[PDB]
Amino acid sequence: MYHNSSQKRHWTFSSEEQLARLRADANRKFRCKAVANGDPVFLEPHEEMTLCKYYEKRLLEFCSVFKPAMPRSVVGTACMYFKRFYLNNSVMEYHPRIIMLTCAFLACKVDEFNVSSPQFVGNLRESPLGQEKALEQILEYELLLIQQLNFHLIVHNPYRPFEGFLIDLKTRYPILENPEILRKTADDFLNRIALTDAYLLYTPSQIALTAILSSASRAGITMESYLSESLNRTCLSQLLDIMKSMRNLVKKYEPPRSEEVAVLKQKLERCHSAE
Amino acid sequence: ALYEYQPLQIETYGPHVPELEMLGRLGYLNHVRAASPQDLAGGYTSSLACHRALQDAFSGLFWQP
Amino acid sequence: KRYEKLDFLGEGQFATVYKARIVAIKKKDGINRTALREIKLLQELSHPNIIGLLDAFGHKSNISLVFDFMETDLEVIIKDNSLVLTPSHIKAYMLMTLQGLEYLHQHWILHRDLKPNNLLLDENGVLKLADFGLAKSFGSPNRAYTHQVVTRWYRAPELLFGARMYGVGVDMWAVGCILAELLLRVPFLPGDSDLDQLTRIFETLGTPTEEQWPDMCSLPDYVTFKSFPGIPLHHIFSAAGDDLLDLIQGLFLFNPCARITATQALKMKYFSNRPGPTPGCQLPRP
Ligand SMILES: CC(C)c1cnn2c(NCc3ccccc3Br)cc(N[C@@H](CO)[C@H](O)CO)nc12
């Protein structure tokens, strides 16, 4: 359960400033080790973040096209793996294209979604030699990914909290006569939350409730009574602040641009070809 | 010396979850997929799924990192 | 590393285990899924009656899992002819097993491999569930499991009839078998195949009908048997008191829904009544 999970104990952070500090520390450590091993080819942390966002979108497309149908819990676990890995590692030391495939592979194993390795790499839309070499890279990076996750493999997604909240609204909140009209928009907001760093900063239940209430506010059914009576005034205030901060995080998210991603892709390929 | 049962005290940082035995009488089970006879014969009911969903929805909702 | 190998303990089909200086180190598909299952579950759990994953690391495919070193297991205790299992000892073992199982089930995990050898005992008499290589999270709808889990002598009748979906009953029935093995010092239902296991179950405890198991006919591998009367439980367990028979009957109910849960078992009069469970310090040493 989340309330005594490794995600709550080690992989939920106070603020995005601590996250930026960890990412900058990773960038600086790789720069130090590379300049010691023996430059403008390096990538700044904001460029690394742009590349990480782009490759998270790539991982999402890969999991959405995956055959057999990959459950959304597996996709969430893989995306969380990607975020956690690139919190403390540089895209210049480990290419995100390989790390994202390793994340999907490990998530498939962890979420008990039994898929054979050849049928896993058959989804990689490459030549059979490409699929085999990608499989070897994935198998070589599997233990590295597990080590960088600190052997914390269970990831609590907001989907089942979302379902529990919808059941609770159907049972105890007749004010919202049909809580199922909120599913489409709340799922869209859950995706937009997943785009940001909210998964590293808020509990899955908070994320699900924030998505549900954002959908409710968008459709016009303000339903603060569910929080006030159905669910300590300081607790309500803290909850509202958490949701407001998460909505602000979704508001300030900037998707990576085509030209920026292109330039950073050439820079990353140059970094990997050299050193 | 003699044993005495004590319920597990695990803080959830969220709203109280209704007991599994009360889910049917509180109206929750009318909003979950009904368990098929095969599942019931196995020992699995819709009550378990509803309880898990609610426990996850309420877990850590009030927790501050 | 900090873990320097000290002695050899044994070798399993998926990993090798040795005692390291005191802990126990367990060593194109990539990393073994059994090891990943044990890692992903034991990192999320922490109970005195559940084996703890102290640390984990490795190189390439091979992974080192650090556990607390356990002195012995319940199988050695049961098979020890010299050792005598008083009702207090049986109560203590049952209580620790059930507390661990109650914690495990509260977190929506089925052990699915319960047997006396998988119940390890330390030097302080604390019993821990081990071997989570078959454990799985339960409660998710539309997520079929496998019915081949649990060693056959402890496999529940719903599993033997091919139950794809199940709950804590699959552990609970196994628990009952362990209890029987604790009382008779011999395995209770030592079948040779699935059909032989079902025959032994239905011979010792009578065949069940729709009155005791309403939807048994819907299980995909349900086989109709001859009607056995079944030996009365007091004849099987002559030295057992009435409360113990109540506990055994609850554990061995054919209807898995009606089968008593770990929490319900812990609330039974058997554990409350005299004598109390033996403290771990005075538990028998094999
Ligand atoms: C948690 C686990 C890694 C562990 C902890 N201790 N331990 C011991 N200790 C001593 C002992 C000796 C005899 C009978 C029981 C026991 Br207990 C043996 C062992 N046997 C290995 C053999 O490969 C298998 O994994 C079977 O579990 N495993 C473990």
Structural domains present in chain C: 4-68 (3.30.200.20), 72-268 (1.10.510.10)
* Residue among A20, A27, A49 nearest A256 (CA): A49
Q: Rounded to an integer, what distance in angstroms lies between the CA atom of residue C198 and that of residue C178?
A: 17
CA distances to A47, A265, B10, C82 from A43, in Å: 6, 10, 45, 70
> Ligand 1 centroid to C193 CA: how many Å?
27
Nearest one of C178, C171, C199 to C256, comparing CA atoms: C171
Best substitution site from C51, C54, C70 to test ligand 1's pocket, by max atoms within 8 Å of Cβ?
C70
Residues of C in contact with A4 (CB under 8 A): 44, 46
C272 CB-near residues (< 8 Å, 6+ apart): B2, B3, B4, B5
Catalytic, out of C7, C80, C113, C196: C113
What is the residue type of A125?
A: R
Q: How far is A166 from chain B (nearest CA, A)?
A: 9
CA A31 and chain centroid, separation: 25
CA dihedral angle for residue C71, residue C72, residue C77, residue C81, rounded to 10 degrees: -80
Angle among Cα B33, B38, B44 to the nearest 5 degrees reads 60
Q: How far is CA B13 from the centre of its chain?
A: 16
Six token digits for residue C285: 């040493």
Distance from the alpha carbon of residue C16 to the mean position of ligand 1, in angstroms: 10
What does this entry list as its resolution, in Å? 2.2
Chain B residues whose beta carbon lies within 8 Å of the beta carbon of residue A171: 26-28, 30-31
What is the Cα–Cα distance from A115 to C65, expressed in whole angstroms?
25
A207, A158 Cβ separation under 8 angstroms: yes
Is position C131 annotated as part of the catalytic site?
A: no
User: Are the beta carbons of B60 and A14 separated by less than 8 Å?
Assistant: no
Instruction: Dig out the tokens for A182 from the structure.
Output: 């909120």
Q: How many CA atoms lie within 13 A of C221 on its CB side?
A: 15
Place of tokens 């599997």: A142
Q: Contact C56/A151, CB-based, under 8 Å?
A: yes
Our answer on whether the CB atom of C12 is closer than 6 Å to any ligand 1 atom is yes
Neighbouring chains of A at 3+ CB pairs within 8 Å? B, C
* Domains of chain A from N-terminus onward: 3-155+255-274 (1.10.472.10), 159-253 (1.10.472.10)
Q: Which of A79, A46, A52 is nearest to A194 (CA)?
A: A79
Give the span between the Cα atoms of A153 and A41, in whole angstroms: 34
The answer to whether the peptide bond before residue B7 is cis (omega within 30 degrees of 0) is: no
| Chain A interface test: which of B61, B63, B64 (most A C-beta within 10 Å) | B61
Cα–Cα distance for residue pair C90/C82, rounded to 1 Å: 16
Structure solved via: cryo-EM
